[PDB]
Structures are given as structure tokens and as C-alpha cells.
């Protein structure tokens, strides 16, 4: 039911693309996401569960045939759980006990709101006690001069883990356990390695509250984008909205689609569930249903570890 | 580990720095801080300890002025410029064995009075020779640096 992904060494999940030497008189550089996107985690299990007799040009019609349904990802150090929390470009790894009073916090008076929010991302933010940015710098050597090439230098801020950390997901499938278990995986990045571990864990499947946490990017179907962005306060209480690419598919070596999403760790109001349903058309509902299977539209209650969905 | 030894080196020095009224005794101490620290780690601790006490010329009011320096701040070291300096460095070494609990303070203070017990002090330090030499290093090296800095020629 529950899958722990144990990184054996610093990882890198880069966004923003174009990490390779193209321009002559210039270095390259890449950062890393603190939490891997669900496309990354889906592609990892899809890599284990791969049979050539499938797909032929799909990468999600092909992917959704392998895994049943994945739920969003968070952190687990020592049996504690930490969850992404996002603000106006600030990201924090906050503990479960601090999300309870967010809806009352986001509604307080001006000065009492800022103080409460400020202390969440600075004092009660447990990210930097758990994760450090190891800014590795690499180099390409030409065997002719046996020195560095013309500006073939790159900086890659890896994801160093000060403590023991796992990424936590849940799968609807149970025939999946004895397949992806104890497996050494090439957890997406610069050829890095993590270990997989499956154990049972009972959590809710569907709930109703007035404020959810986005435990995974909530994809916006690019057709409601106008009727959604013009009135954003009706849907997102706090967090970050931006255009993201869904990744890079292996079987075709192509960058996946690029569509606006609500980044994981945002606080979405209940108004976001019905809005999506009443804006997504069945032309794409069959598509966005798959996007949910790999783990994108995953919501969490600020109460407790209860995992909802949007189209499900 | 030895982060509080740079502190200890500052209270021990400020004591020795004040119980050295004569200017030529400070200069003579600056000579001991440089030299004595470099024989403890080439010749050994107790070979240098024997050399220190032999030049310190104990068994006087000096040997009791030391006992006062452990607590009082008005004590003074009187004697030959070469004696006060060598005896002031004996304080430095003993002040550390007290504050760090390597040697019991009550033993050391009564071994510095009872003539019959001083041999038992030297006998105790012989077995604590490896342990002591390791710990005093940061402390003595700091005393060496403070001497070269604070003890100046007029």
C-alpha cells in the first residue's frame, strides 16, 4: 500500500530544462526540486514494470496500464511526516501538527496573519534541518590538453539529506508489493540511486473539507486558465501557480507537455474541486483521469492524513 | 573538545601576569612560555616537569604563594627573576590539572604543603604523564601565544 523511496545519496530533480553545454562562452547551471513531481515517481515504477508489448507512442496510456493509482508524495524522516507548504515563492517542509490552524490563520487580521505565516516558513519550517543544497560543480576535460574544455563547467545544486529521509507515496494496487520491493532504482536525476520499500498503511481515500493541501501539482486544463486566473483568490488560499512541463518520456526521448499547475504545498479551497469538474470536458477528462492515476491531482486534508483526489 | 581551554588560558595567564611585579620577571616568563612548551612535546612531560621544579626552587613562602594564587588575586611571586618565572609556569601547569579534574584539587593543595606528600604528587603525575601531555597542549600553546602578545618590552 505505502511505498518508501530511500535515497542512498544526494539526488537532483531539476526543472527549467536545458542543462547541457550549448553556448560557447557561458557555463551551465541547474537547481533541484525539493519534492519530485509525480511524473518522476510514476516513471520510476513504470521503468521497473516495463513490457515492450504495450504503448507505441503514449507514455501515459502506456504508463497507466502498469500502475493502478499513486497518491501524492511527502517526507518521512523517523516516522514523522513532513508536508510541502508553499507561499509566494517560499517553500517549507512543515510537520502535520501545524496545518490544522491554517484556514483560521489565513483569515486573521492583517498584522496577526503576517506574524503567524512568517513563523511557519522561518521558525516552524523544518526543511533546512533535513535537506541541504549540495552545490556540486562538474567539468568536462579534453584529453588533448588534459585541462578543462572551453567553459564546459556546470553547477548542479543536488539535494543533500542531513538525516534519513524517505519519499512517501501510496498505491491502490497490492499485487504490486512483491514486485517493487527491495529494488534498487535509478530515481530520476543525474544517474542517482534510491531504494524502494513497501509496507501496508491504512489511510482514507475520499473526504470533504473546505481547505485542502496540494500534495502534488494540480493540473489546470489550459482551457479554464482564463476563467481561473482572473479570479485566483476564489480557488487558492496560498501557494504558487506556474507553468510546468510534465517531464521527459524515455520510450520516445521527447519532453512531455507543458501546462499550468498549482504547485505542491499550496492550499486550495474547496471551490477548486467542483470548478475543475465543471470546466474540464470529456474530450480531456479521459486524459486528465490518467494524469490523476500517475498521481497529479492529489489533495490532503489539513485535519489528518486523508488523501482525496479531484476527478476521483 | 578543548573550546574552554582558551578560556582557562586567559584566567590563568591574567593571574600569572599580575603576580609578576618586576618587569624582568614578565620577560623571564615570556621566555618560559615559548621554551617550556616545546620540551614537553620533544623531551616529554615529566622530564620537563623535573626541570621545571628543579629551577623553580620551591619550599618557601613562594610554595605557599602558589596555593594562594589558586584562589586569591592579590598574591605575588617573590624570588629570583629566573625563579618566579619558572615557578609561575609551574602554576600554569598545576592550574590546569586542577580546573580539569585530572588531579584532585584537595590532594594537590595539601601535597604542596606537606613535604612528605610532594613525592606522591610527582609519583601521581608520572602515571598521568600520557593523559596530561595530550590535554594541556591546546592550553599551553595558548599560553605561549598570550605571552608573546601581552608580555611586551618597554
Amino acid at each position: 500500500k505505502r511505498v518508501l523511496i530511500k535515497p542512498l545519496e544526494p539526488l537532483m530533480f531539476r526543472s527549467q530544462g536545458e542543462f547541457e553545454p550549448l553556448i560557447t562562452g557561458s557555463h551551465t547551471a541547474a537547481q533541484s526540486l525539493i519534492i519530485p513531481r509525480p511524473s518522476t515517481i510514476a516513471g520510476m515504477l513504470g521503468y521497473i514494470l516495463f513490457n515492450k508489448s504495450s504503448g507505441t507512442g503514449d507514455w501515459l496510456s502506456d504508463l497507466t496500464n502498469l500502475l493502478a493509482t499513486i497518491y501524492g508524495t511527502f517526507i518521512e524522516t523517523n516516522g514523522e511526516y513532513l508536508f510541502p507548504l508553499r507561499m509566494g515563492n517560499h517553500l517549507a517542509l512543515v510537520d502535520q501538527q501545524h496545518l490544522i490552524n491554517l484556514p483560521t490563520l489565513l483569515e486573521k487580521e492583517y498584522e496577526r496573519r503576517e506574524k503567524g505565516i512568517y513563523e511557519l516558513f522561518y521558525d516552524k519550517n523544518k526543511l533546512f534541518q533535513i535537506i541541504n543544497h549540495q552545490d556540486r560543480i562538474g567539468i568536462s576535460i579534453d584529453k588533448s590538453t588534459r585541462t578543462v574544455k572551453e567553459h564546459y563547467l556546470y553547477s548542479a545544486r543536488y539535494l543533500a539529506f542531513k538525516k534519513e529521509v524517505n519519499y512517501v507515496i501510496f498505491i491502490d494496487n497490492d499485487a504490486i508489493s512483491d514486485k517493487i520491493n527491495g529494488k534498487i532504482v535509478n530515481f530520476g536525476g543525474e544517474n542517482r540511486i534510491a531504494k524502494l520499500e513497501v509496507d501496508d498503511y491504512k489511510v482514507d481515500t475520499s473526504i470533504e473539507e473546505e481547505y485542502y493541501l496540494a500534495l502534488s501539482p494540480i493540473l489546470i486544463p489550459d482551457e479554464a486558465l482564463d476563467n481561473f486566473l482572473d479570479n485566483i483568490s476564489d480557488y487558492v488560499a496560498m501557494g504558487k501557480v506556474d507553468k510546468i512541463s510534465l517531464g521527459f518520456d524515455i520510450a520516445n526521448t521527447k519532453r512531455k507537455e507543458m501546462l499550468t499547475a498549482i504547485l505542491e504545498g499550496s492550499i486550495v479551497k474547496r471551490s477548486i474541486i467542483d470548478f475543475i469538474k465543471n470546466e474540464i470536458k470529456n474530450d480531456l477528462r479521459y486524459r486528465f483521469s490518467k494524469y490523476e492515476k500517475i498521481g497529479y491531482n492529489t489533495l490532503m486534508s489539513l485535519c489528518k492524513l486523508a488523501l482525496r483526489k479531484i476527478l476521483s | 573538545l578543548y573550546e574552554e581551554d582558551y578560556k582557562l588560558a586567559l584566567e590563568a595567564f591574567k593571574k600569572v601576569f599580575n603576580a609578576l611585579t618586576h618587569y624582568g620577571a614578565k620577560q623571564a616568563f615570556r621566555s618560559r612560555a615559548r621554551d617550556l612548551v616545546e620540551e614537553i612535546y620533544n623531551s616529554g612531560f615529566i622530564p620537563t616537569f623535573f626541570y621545571i621544579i628543579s629551577k623553580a626552587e620551591l619550599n618557601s613562602d613562594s610554595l605557599d604563594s602558589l596555593i594562594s594564587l589558586f584562589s586569591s588575586d592579590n598574591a605575588i611571586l617573590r624570588g629570583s627573576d629566573e625563579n618566579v618565572s619558572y615557578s609561575a609556569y609551574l602554576f600554569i601547569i598545576l592550574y590546569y590539572l586542577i580546573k580539569r579534574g585530572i588531579i584532585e584539587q584537595k590532594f594537590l593543595i595539601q601535597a604542596l604543603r606537606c613535604e612528605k606528600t610532594r613525592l606522591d604528587l610527582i609519583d601521581k603525575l608520572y602515571n598521568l604523564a600520557p593523559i596530561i601531555s595530550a590535554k594541556i597542549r591546546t592550553y599551553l600553546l595558548a599560553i605561549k601565544r598570550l605571552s608573546e602578545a601581552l608580555i611586551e618590552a618597554r
Binding site: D135, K143, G182, I184, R192 | L1, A134
Partner: protein, 285 residues
């Protein structure tokens, strides 16, 4: 699984090492070693693979394609690689020792901490599920040591007291009574607490100043002074080489890996700062 096998190995510094990292850390070192998440020296997987791949292409120039299939094909062709190195993890650093007769006398000893031995265990557990050449003879030893966590430990020697690096007095306890040592060198291995070990280890790291001299007046230039950090001789880094299932890796693991004894990692080879030795924990166990 596409990680059919895993070949852990020990990286044994024949000379001092310097795998550089720019100017990433503070202490006073201008050219420091490559660190890890908690401050110990490591060899990054990029530097360890690139050095072994730059080597071994001059050594076996006929097998350049076998190496390209496994180690990357640095050319514009971008078929996926078949072999992965994990970051080399500091396993044991040499330390000067003065023991109070305490023994058959030693002058130097191997020193580990419990933080370092957890990451080694982490690497060891992670590949036990695919290594059907199960090296539990080694994984168990770390397990018993980690059970005794919370005090300074000597594995096979019987010292009970020593002075490490002329500055730190520690009292040691046998594992339970005895156990075979990992490194077959006739040298004890101490496992210290993480606070005391981090000071003893930082004292074995070589931090030198270096000088550029005005050749006409034989004096140092202006700003011709800088500082570097080396990892001593006899240091031991532990890493793993993971291989996907293929026919090239069968050649690579049989024909190529048997003949790697000495390679050169890091930089400053002119100073002779890269000669290192791999030991392939499948015969030392």
C-alpha cells in the same frame, strides 16, 4: 530489475588524494576536498566515474566500445549507460595513536565514526537483495558495531586507552570480545562517537599552505600563497558499482574490473596526488 549485480569496492589512497570542489566550504582552505551532507570527505560519483573512465580508455584502448556501453559513450551518441557509481563514502581515515603500553604497540590506527558506518550499512543493505553473492560476512560486522553505538570501540585490538592525533584521549571497549577485522592490514580499527570522531578525523585531514616563488628573487609573489586540503595516504573510501543486465557488463565486470588495481582520481597529479587502489569487496571477504 535492470540492476542485475552490484560490485562494492574499497578506494585505498596510495598517495594523498585531492578531489577538488572549487571553494565550497569555509574553514580556511582555498581548494578544499569534496565534502558530503555532514562534512566528511567524499568522492562524487561524477569524479569517480570520469576518472575511472578517463583511465581505462588509455589502458584498454581496444575495448573502448565495451567501456562506452557501460560508462557512458561521451561522444554525441546518447544511448543510456549500463553502469553507475555511488558516491565514495569515507570509511576509515588513518590516525596517529599513542597507547599507554596497552597492547602490542602501534603508531597509527584506522578511525571511523558511527555516522560514517551507517552510510556504509545503508549501501550494504541496499544491494543485498540483488547480490546473490551475499556479502553478509561483511554486512553483519557493521551491524554488530552499530549495535554497540554510543561509545568508543576497538574491533580486534585490546587497548582500552589511547591518544589519537596527539590531542584526544579516548578509552576503548572491545566489540564484545573479538571479531575479524575488515581491512586485512594488521592495523586496529576504532569507531568513535560522532562528536569525538569528527575532531579526530578533521585532524588527520592534511591542510597545507602552498607558495608560488618569484624565480628571480626567490621570494614569494604577492598573493602567491593559497591553501589546499588532502586526504592522507592509507585512507579508505567505500563505493559500489551498480550494473544493469547486459552482455557488455558481463565482459566489463569480468575482463575489465579484474585488472583494475590502481587508478588515478582527483587532481594535482603533478604533485602525485591521485594514485589510489581499488580492492573489490568480493575477494577480501
Amino acid at each position: 530489475p535492470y540492476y542485475a549485480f552490484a560490485e562494492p569496492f574499497f578506494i585505498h589512497a596510495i598517495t594523498h588524494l585531492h578531489v577538488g570542489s572549487g571553494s565550497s566550504v569555509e574553514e580556511e582552505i582555498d581548494l578544499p576536498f569534496q565534502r558530503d551532507e555532514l562534512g566528511y570527505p567524499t568522492i562524487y560519483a561524477s569524479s569517480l566515474k570520469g576518472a575511472i573512465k578517463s583511465f581505462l580508455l588509455k589502458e584498454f584502448p581496444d575495448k573502448r566500445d565495451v567501456i562506452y556501453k557501460v560508462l557512458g559513450e561521451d561522444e554525441n551518441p546518447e544511448e543510456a549507460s549500463l553502469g553507475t557509481f555511488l558516491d565514495a563514502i569515507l570509511f576509515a581515515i588513518p590516525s596517529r595513536i599513542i597507547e599507554i603500553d596497552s597492547a602490542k604497540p602501534y603508531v597509527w590506527v584506522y578511525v571511523t565514526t558511527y555516522e560514517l558506518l551507517k552510510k556504509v550499512k545503508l549501501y550494504l543493505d541496499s544491494i543485498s537483495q540483488l547480490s546473490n553473492a551475499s556479502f553478509s560476512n561483511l554486512k553483519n560486522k557493521i551491524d554488530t558495531i552499530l549495535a554497540k553505538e554510543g561509545k568508543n570501540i576497538t574491533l580486534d585490538s585490546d587497548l582500552k586507552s589511547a591518544i589519537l592525533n596527539e590531542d584526544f584521549y579516548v578509552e576503548l571497549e572491545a566489540l564484545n570480545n573479538k571479531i575479524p577485522s575488515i581491512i586485512n592490514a594488521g592495523v586496529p580499527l576504532l569507531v568513535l562517537e560522532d562528536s569525538i570522531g569528527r575532531e579526530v578525523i578533521n585532524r588527520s585531514l592534511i591542510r597545507v599552505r602552498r607558495i608560488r616563488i618569484d624565480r628571480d628573487k626567490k621570494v614569494v609573489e604577492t598573493g602567491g600563497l593559497w591553501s589546499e586540503e588532502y586526504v592522507p595516504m592509507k585512507t579508505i573510501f567505500f563505493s559500489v558499482l551498480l550494473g544493469k543486465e547486459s552482455k557488455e557488463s558481463a565482459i566489463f565486470a569480468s575482463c575489465i574490473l579484474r585488472n583494475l588495481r590502481y587508478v588515478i582520481l582527483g587532481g594535482k597529479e603533478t604533485i602525485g596526488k591521485g594514485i589510489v587502489e581499488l580492492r573489490w569487496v568480493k575477494d577480501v571477504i
